[model samples]
Target: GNFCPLCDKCYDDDDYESKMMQCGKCDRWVHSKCENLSDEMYEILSNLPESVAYTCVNCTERHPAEWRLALEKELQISLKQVLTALLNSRTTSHLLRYRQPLDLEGVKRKMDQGNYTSVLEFSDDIVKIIQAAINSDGGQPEIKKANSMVKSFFIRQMERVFPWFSVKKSRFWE
Candidate 1:
């Protein structure tokens, strides 16, 4: 029986159409109405799993201390999207061939350690990743295009989360 974390009520009823959302962190199912999600948010939750993963409040509270910062939280979300896109991308697949492979995983690992003190420090890793991919000796045109897209998408995600991303050094504060 699926149970809502909020009310601790079972969701096995056949008469109800209450939508249940699962926590990305704990995999626990919660009724949208019980979670008090606006229909708009529930819709986004249901459809945008590739771009957005919902963590139940319980799991959010249980996050590692490194994930407590706003920048870390957003960057982790961005990492999720980057991996999701790369999985379906054909041109981005030959990463094994690269001699100096500094990738999202490296960036994410450093992030988990709370080593990045500024957004630019994190940004530097991504730039290095894309730069290496583009400068790889055997790179194909399609691969470069895919790498470009990756840069654009990751930057746009950052911009969406931080209004000051395009503005200046203020982005480094967070």
Candidate 2:
């Protein structure tokens, strides 16, 4: 049976209410809607050169390692932004540097060891790490704003992997 990862339902040619398109990478059938491709996006994707591949979320060749790398990269970028904001505010950045530091390396190690079974688990840990940092830093406005930015950034990264996920549909980490 052909199954769509987005909706977790089996589909076949007989089920034609929704148009199904094959994934360029995995060769699996997925409804265009399941992949959330707007008409404009779909048209653009359809016209892309054959050299480019349209991989479905589940068909990511890098798998867990790629996910780990994405999380690590996003964390680094967000942390850099947060640090820059702290510096701009003329406040000692040592408070955030020492208090509630994120173990991103450790997280990657765990991910490489297959400790994480799903993207949600990895996202949860990252959120918890950032939340702990925010909680320990008291009510500093800059830190709070930076924390919010980090959260949004992480959410965006996660969505890049799982298109079905959204802030309104799948509220993660409050």
Candidate 3:
């Protein structure tokens, strides 16, 4: 098993064979994920001969954002559920339904469909849900606080994705 240089993960542990690559320069391995290599790129790299070599960022001058892929994993683990708890406990999903829009369900679909780039889209959908909850003349004090709670929950998880990236109770309601 080739151990990925960035993640320090092993190729054998991953189900996909192409997920790991041997860096031509260091003779070490890197995860396709760690390098953000696409499936098509992996396909091409897999069949390359000794005439050419697949080099890595450390080996070459190309410096990709090292944290993004890892951040993505953390987002899925951390922020994905921020709104989920909101919907269930706040009495809002059913209430937000009267407003005739909810995409946490659709967001779930897009998560499976791989249709949209998120956790941005995931957050956007929740932002709308919270927005719906905030609308006036149709609002109750109960859901206003619920909306507030979920909004903070949403931003806080995103904040976890970034420690200094933490920016809570500020971005939404615009």
Best by TM-score: 3
Give the per-residue lDDT of model 2 (tens digit) for 76-98. Answer: 44334433443343233333333
- Candidate RMSDs in Å, in order, are 11.9, 9.6, 12.5
Better of 1 and 3 by TM-score: 3
- What is the lDDT, from 0 to 100, of the residue 121 in candidate 3? 50
Task: Give the alpha carbon lDDT tens digit for every residue of 1-174 in model 3.
Answer: 767677776666667555577766778777777866555445334544232366666776444443334333444544445545545654545555344125466555555454544444555666666665566525677766776666666566655543333244335555
In terms of lDDT, which candidate is stronger, 2 or 3?
3
Is 1 or 2 the stronger prediction by TM-score? 2
* Candidate 2 wrong stretches, greater than 4 Å: 1-13, 16-102, 166-172
The TM-score of predicted model 3 comes to: 0.45
Which 10-residue span in candidate 3 carries the lowest summed lDDT? 161-170
What is candidate 1's CA lDDT for residue 136?
Answer: 64
> What are the TM-scores, per candidate, against the unseen true structure?
0.40, 0.42, 0.45
Residue 9 C-alpha lDDT in model 3: 65
Using lDDT as the measure, what is the rank order of every candidate, best first?
Answer: 1, 3, 2
Residue 95, model 2: lDDT of 32
Error of 2 at 117 (Å): 2.2
